[PDB]
Write a protein that binds this ligand. Sequence first.
Ligand SMILES: [Cl-]
Ligand code: NA
Ligand code: NA
Length: 443
Amino acid sequence: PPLSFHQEFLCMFDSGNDGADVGPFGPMYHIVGAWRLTGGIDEETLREALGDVVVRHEALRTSLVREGGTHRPEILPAGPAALEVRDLGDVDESERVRRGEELLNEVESTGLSVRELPLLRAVLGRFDQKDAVLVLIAHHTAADAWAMHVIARDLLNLYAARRGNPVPPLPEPAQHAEFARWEREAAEAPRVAVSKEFWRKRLQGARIIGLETDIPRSAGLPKGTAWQRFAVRGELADAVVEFSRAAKCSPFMTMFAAYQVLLHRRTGELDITVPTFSGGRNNSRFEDTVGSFINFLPLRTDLSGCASFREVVLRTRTTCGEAFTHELPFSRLIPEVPELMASAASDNHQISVFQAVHAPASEGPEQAGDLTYSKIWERQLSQAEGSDIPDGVLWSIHIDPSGSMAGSLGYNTNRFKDETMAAFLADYLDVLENAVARPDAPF
Ligand SMILES: [Cl-]
Ligand code: NA
Ligand code: NA
């Protein structure tokens, strides 16, 4: 079982054995999610189901241990099924959403090693016999956002079946090891050489844009990542969706375009390269597969001579189109363009990423047997010390089918002050509002 291309990418951010258990192979590099559960719960059966879902998915039993400078995967037997339960209190609805968010944040501030099991934990916060919040946490080498959606679906299905309630069969999943194999076969395909030649040309002289940090790398402050949560207001959300529809661009392309406009205004640059993370799940064989598939994907757009926001969005659409056509695993692309990140490691800058969360489509509450479950996307509570960002700034946007959007802005507290990032976020929301309100005005 070799490291995936994604895991190779993470190695590029690994601080090494250095006295500090931090970064992507440390215990804070995890992903958390929360679901509101309506219906009665048998806790013992839910715990058994959690055991079931770890047996089901090898990625959730694949530890990563330091060996000879790198990390060796080893697929282990599932550990003991475990579930923590808390009595959050029989309180009124607004207090429930609030206590749910607090539980989510508290779990995110706890650690979860990759070096031994478990790689998935669960905390169930119950309000009363028929309302609860289920929080899952998984190491982010083992699961991405799409994987967390799969874990929750599988878990509640396996639970329902144990309870003897009607649910459809789960498909047999492909294991992540199978994907690790497949992606290396794909890397030898003839289109690869064609795509490499595309990227060498496209990214000639390109440098990912850096954000100036408040605190230099050399100050050596302890690693931490904070998160500021935001939501795109109904009015603004509706304007973004309508603009995008009419422009024949996705809402993500619009929000990415607005980010480019913001960086142009912040840095003066017109030649703008900003990475996103693609979903990395083009191959539908792996749609029921738990693992971390996402892929660092550089998007270079030339904003020079743009007459309007609309033209920025259209150029973005072009850039996105050719990026996905020629997409390559970043660990294989970067040696072809080896100076692309020269502002990642600089003493006074970090790179930022702007991503859409990739997760299967859902509109409304879902049901498994006698349980209804609804992903909690709207977060408002910021986090002083949460899921780790190895080295940079991350914008993470969830775009709801309903029209609504929930976002997070994460940054390393050893490099940025909260106020700087607060202003950055507020500047972005203002740019976005003005852009879709007057998209054909001079930019
Ligand atoms: Cl993710
Ligand atoms: Na662990
Ligand atoms: Na029943």
